[PDB]
């Protein structure tokens, strides 16, 4: 009457493929060992809690977004504020850096992810295009290319935007709940999103359809990140647990959680080799997880408020973290 | 002496940007942030002066910034925390709407929905120390309706006179009773009406009282 049999048909097929868990394979893998993470550059100047931060492709420039209405691009090595962008909307919740480094996107409660062009003859950051059209707050905006940007919004829909056209090229509506985070694959052909429905769905950019759905999390998914190989991605939720999903397996392979952790997870990232899982936790701390053995190989501290955003450099040599205390610290 | 000339220029630009950011922060600090929730919201906004709408109104030399979170049908558990630190929360309800059912196969009532929202906002963890400026709008229509139809339809257990004063007082007390942390936060209630500055002055008085009480608490006196 209402597709009763279909649900279990997928369930049985997914169950049948479980032969050996990831834990068994990684028994012979040596542990990472203690990671002597220490703060090297303390980027400060934000006067309000920050929510999003994204590294540049050069691994030196990074963009920071804060509710104070100011977007600051930081020079990691010299700690210099290369640019300051006064946002018209003072409720930004997401930011992105174009791979070419020419454009910056900012979005939040306002239903717009404004595109900011850094490279101008007049030498100022002026709004290039305003991607209005969402019915709810924008949760995450990420650039596939310098002209195409994918957006996540609380209206339960993700959208592909042709920046030149200023209209949604494709709308993703399979989520039965608000979408919180968005991550792009290395090839940019496909992306994934997380939702408050405690599930993540695989989205193909050009055909505009869902390929797979994952529902391991018990609560809302807050952050997601693609594995460097591109065949898997990790997701963080309010469950206080991080989960790894393999696209070719359609099944969760391992859970990263501890008994002493009860608060939700706010950020997720991978190292260049993919062995380290940088998860930002609501308890003012970031825990480093052995992606293969699912063990706490290290921990980061020094934040006086909730950790909001973090990201590893494409060079893989340092990781920056963001917190509501308004301080950005880079660890190497 | 280990920095080149371009590095020195970059440092100068960075410190100038820092000065500009500090100046902007100082400008923003001297402002009052009020959250509007609710039902006469448009009428209250008019009398006071798809996403978040900001209204800036200055009264008695104090600048007030009111952010309207209306039209955001998305779950509020994921963006309500962005409003931490607001001096006061303006919650507006319509008295005349006790007889309305908000459609939906009459599964809810507008007064019940309003009280549920008020309880959720007041008992929210982020607002454990935020005063609420409760507004009861549409008093004239409330009186006109209670003249014919008693409010007991919305309140099965209220056995009392149907006069305007008693019914309004009972509704106000019912809204007040939702406070589970009455000691920490004050709930200002006003029968707003829709004429003159009777709302702007009440908001100003509530803000002044909240500020004074917070200052006294800081010293430990109050």
């Amino acid at each position, epitope marked *: 009457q209402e597709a009763e049999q279909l649900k279990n048909q997928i369930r049985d097929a997914r169950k049948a493929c479980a032969d050996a868990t990831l834990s068994q394979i990684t028994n012979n893998i040596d542990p990472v060992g203690r990671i002597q993470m220490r703060t090297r550059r303390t980027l400060r100047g934000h006067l309000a809690k920050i929510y999003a931060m994204h590294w540049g492709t050069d691994s*030196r*420039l990074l963009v920071s977004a804060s509710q104070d209405g100011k977007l600051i691009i930081w*020079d990691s090595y*010299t700690t*210099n504020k*290369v*640019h300051a962008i006064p946002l018209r909307s003072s409720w930004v919740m997401t930011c992105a850096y174009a791979p070419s*480094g020419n454009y910056v996107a900012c979005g939040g409660l306002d239903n717009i992810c404004s595109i900011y062009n850094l*490279k101008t*003859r*007049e*030498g*100022n950051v002026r709004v290039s295009r305003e991607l209005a059209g969402h019915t709810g707050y924008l949760s995450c905006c990420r650039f596939l290319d310098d002209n195409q940007i994918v957006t996540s919004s609380g209206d339960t829909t993700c959208a592909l935007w042709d920046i030149e056209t200023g209209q949604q090229t494709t709308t993703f509506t399979g989520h039965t709940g608000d979408v919180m985070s968005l991550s792009l694959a290395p090839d940019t052909r496909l992306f994934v999103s997380g939702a408050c429905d405690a599930s993540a769905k695989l989205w193909d950019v050009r055909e505009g359809m869902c390929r797979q759905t994952f529902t391991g999390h018990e609560s809302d998914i807050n952050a997601i990140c693609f594995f460097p190989n591109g065949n898997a991605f990790a997701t963080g939720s309010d469950d206080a647990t991080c989960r790894l999903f393999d696209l070719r397996a359609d099944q969760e392979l391992m859970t990263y959680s501890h008994d002493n952790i009860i608060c939700g997870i706010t950020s997720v990232s991978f190292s260049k080799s993919g062995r380290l899982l940088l998860a930002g936790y609501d308890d003012f701390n970031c825990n480093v997880w052995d992606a293969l053995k699912a063990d706490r190989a290290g921990v980061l501290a020094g934040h006086d408020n909730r950790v909001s955003c973090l990201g590893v450099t494409d060079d893989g040599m340092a990781v920056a973290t963001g917190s509501w205390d308004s301080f950005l610290k880079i660890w190497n | 002496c*280990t920095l*080149s*000339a*371009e*590095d*020195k*220029a*970059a440092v*100068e*630009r960075s410190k*100038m940007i820092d000065r500009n950011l500090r100046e902007d922060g100082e400008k923003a600090a001297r402002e009052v942030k009020l959250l509007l929730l609710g039902s006469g919201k448009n009428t209250i906004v008019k009398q006071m002066k798809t996403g978040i709408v900001e209204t800036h109104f200055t009264f008695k030399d104090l600048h007030f910034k009111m952010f309207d979170v209306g039209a955001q049908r998305s779950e509020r558990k994921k963006w309500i925390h962005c409003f931490e630190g607001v001096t006061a929360i303006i919650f507006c309800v319509a008295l005349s709407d006790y007889d309305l059912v908000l459609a939906d196969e009459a599964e809810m009532n507008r007064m019940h929905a309003s009280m549920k929202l008020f309880d959720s906002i007041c008992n929210n963890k982020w607002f454990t120390d935020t005063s609420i400026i409760l507004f009861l709008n549409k008093k004239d229509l409330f009186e006109e309706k209670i003249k014919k139809s008693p409010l007991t339809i919305c309140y099965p257990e209220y056995a009392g006179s149907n006069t305007y004063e008693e019914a309004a007082a009972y509704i106000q007390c019912q809204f007040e009773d939702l406070n589970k942390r009455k000691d920490t936060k004050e709930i200002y209630t006003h029968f707003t009406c829709s004429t003159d500055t009777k709302n702007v002055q009440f908001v100003f008085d509530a803000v002044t009282d909240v500020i004074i009480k917070n200052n006294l608490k800081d010293c430990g006196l109050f």
Partner: single-chain antibody
Amino acid sequence: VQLVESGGGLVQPGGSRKLSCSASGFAFSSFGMHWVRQAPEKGLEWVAYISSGSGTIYYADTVKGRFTISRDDPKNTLFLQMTSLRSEDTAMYYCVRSIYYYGSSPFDFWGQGTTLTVSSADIVMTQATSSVPVTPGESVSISCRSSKSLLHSNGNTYLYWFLQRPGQSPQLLIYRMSNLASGVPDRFSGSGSGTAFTLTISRLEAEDVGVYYCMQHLEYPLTFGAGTKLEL
């Protein structure tokens, strides 16, 4: 973007004249300003510098004291006071704008300048050839040398290549010895060692004819080479 200079004219020795530049099309406050002179039938020479906010002000040895610079951010105009003009001061001053941050392009725009007709550890930049006869469609290479290593420990080679076509202001081609300036053909390319630098034109065109100049920015006493004059 446009920069227009004013105040040029004939001044007798010992007089004082102020040269003013008007900005239009960009944020004058954000950009820094420079003054580069060019004596008739001669090369370039940096004159003075002022940074955004007037915090940093520098002058060349030959003009320090006599010449002072100031900025007026509200009006978007630059001023360069000149006192006790000497016969050596007879040159056409060009106003330049630079912005200093990672990935920036200092000296990315040059004005038409204002003509003025009057009457030590410095890194000297020397160019091998003053002029080189060339023909269109043939690769052309220009080499310059520096007395001191311009490659700082940060890893950036502070070499700037400027092209000044006949009857036109200088144009920036390469600003850090490896990066092409905005609005320039990809034909131009830059390469060199810590002390030797070379500018290669992949295929010479008609517009390429002009005088090529080099500059060092590691130390603020900027020095310009004699220049390479390509002719068809």
